[PDB]
Amino acid sequence: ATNDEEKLADIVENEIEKEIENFYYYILRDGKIYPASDYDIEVEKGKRSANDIYAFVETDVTRDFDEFLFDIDYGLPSISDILKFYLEKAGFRIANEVPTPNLKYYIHAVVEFPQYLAVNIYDIDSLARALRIPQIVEQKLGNKPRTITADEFNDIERIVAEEQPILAGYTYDEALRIPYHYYVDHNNSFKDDALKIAHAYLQLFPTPYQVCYEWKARWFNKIDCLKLERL
Amino acid sequence: IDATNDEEKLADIVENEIEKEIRKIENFYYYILRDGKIYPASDYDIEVEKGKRSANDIYAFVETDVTRDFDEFLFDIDYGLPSISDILKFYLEKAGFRIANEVPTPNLKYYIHAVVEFPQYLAVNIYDIDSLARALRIPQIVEQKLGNKPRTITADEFNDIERIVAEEQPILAGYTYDEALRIPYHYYVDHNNSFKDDALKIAHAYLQLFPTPYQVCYEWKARWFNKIDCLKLERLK
C-alpha cells in the first residue's frame, strides 16, 4: 500500500517539476497523469474512460510559509469532492455526473513559492468515514445502487457539512472557519478553539502518506517532512 | 444619492491600485481610509499595532480574488459575497461590541470584492455592510443571543452566533446560507446541470432580498484598465 503511495507522490512531483498554471489532475491505474479538465472532455467524447481514474490531485500554490504549513498539516479536503467520490465508489450515481467508480486516492499537493512541495496522499474511504459520510448515505439512501437527484445530494451534503459534529463538537463548516481564523488570519482570540480542532483532526482524521521536496537547481529534491516543518 | 458617488470613487481607488500593482498579484487584502488612501491590510495592521495608524480610519475592506477561468470569474462577480465571519465581525464592531482582545474597526462602511481575470478583466463589487448584515438577519440573531447593550464577547459567543447565521436559519429559498453558497457553485463552477432549478430559485431570492452591490467593470487594454459595461463583460468568452 505504502509502495503505491510512494509511486503516486513521485508521479505528482515529476508532473509539478515538468510544469515548472495547472491545479487539478487525474492519475490513471497505469500511473499516467493528466490535467483533470482536458481528461473530462476526452471522457465525454468517448476517447478516455472515467473507470481508469485511480487518484484525484488538487494542487494549491502558496507564497506565505504559515499558509503552506497550515495547508499541508491541517487543510481539510472539499466535503463536496469526498461525498461525490464516496457515493460513486459505493455504486451510486449523481445526476449529470460521469462516475469515477475506481478512485482510491485523494491527493493534495502544496507548492510554496519555487521553494517547496508537499504531497499528501489520502485514502478516500478512510476520509469519508472520518467525515461520517457512510452512515448518513445509508440512513438517507439505503444500500441499493442508484442515480440520486441534485436534491438528494444536497440533503446529504447539508447533514455532513452543517449538522453533524465531526471535530471537538464542531461541524465540518465550523472546522473550516475556526482554525484558518487562528492559523492564517493570525487572530489570537480563536487560539483555544483552533487548537482543540487541530488536536482532534490529527488523531481522528486518517494520517496522510506525506512526501516533501525542496526546490534546488531546477529540481525537487526529496527531503524529510519534519525538516520542512522544523525550518 | 451621494452613496453612488462614493461607490464610484471607491471602485476607481481599487482599480488604480490593482493597475499600479500589475505594472510592477502581490496583495489580496486592502483597507481604504476615510480620506480615500488605499493600503495593503497586513502592513496597515502592523502600523496600528505600533500606534502609527488607527483602525478607526478604516472605511472599506477590500478582498481581491484572482482567477483564470471565465465561468469562475462570472460566478465570483455575481455571488462573491464576503465571508460570514467578516460581516459578523464588521457588524459586531460597528454596533459597539468587542470580540475578545481583538482590535475593532468601528467605522467600516463597505466591503469590497475585486475579481481579476487572467490580465484581461477587473470587476469591483461594493457591498454596504449594514445592508448585508440586515439581509443575513445578523442584528436580530445578535439581539436574541447577546442583547442590545454592547460589551466584549468571547470567541465561543462569536462562534455560536456564526453557526446560527450560516448553518441554521433558512435564509434563501428555504436553504441555510452554506447550502445557498454550494448549490450555485455546483451549477456554475462544477458545471452540473441537475442543480439548475435550485440555483435559479436561490438566485431569484438573493436578487430580491439581499442588497444589490454597486458593480464596476474594466478591461485590460495596452498596459492600463479601461472602463467597460459589466453586462457587456459577461459576453466575453
Residue numbers in the entry:
A (entry chain B): 24 to 43, 55 to 147, 152 to 269
B (entry chain A): 22 to 45, 54 to 147, 152 to 270
What does the paper say about this structure?
Acidianus two-tailed virus (ATV) infects crenarchaea of the genus Acidianus living in terrestrial thermal springs at extremely high temperatures and low pH. ATV is a member of the Bicaudaviridae virus family and undergoes extra-cellular development of two tails, a process that is unique in the viral world. ATV is the fourth most abundant of these proteins. Remarkably, ATV displays a new protein fold, consistent with the absence of homologues of this protein in public sequence databases.
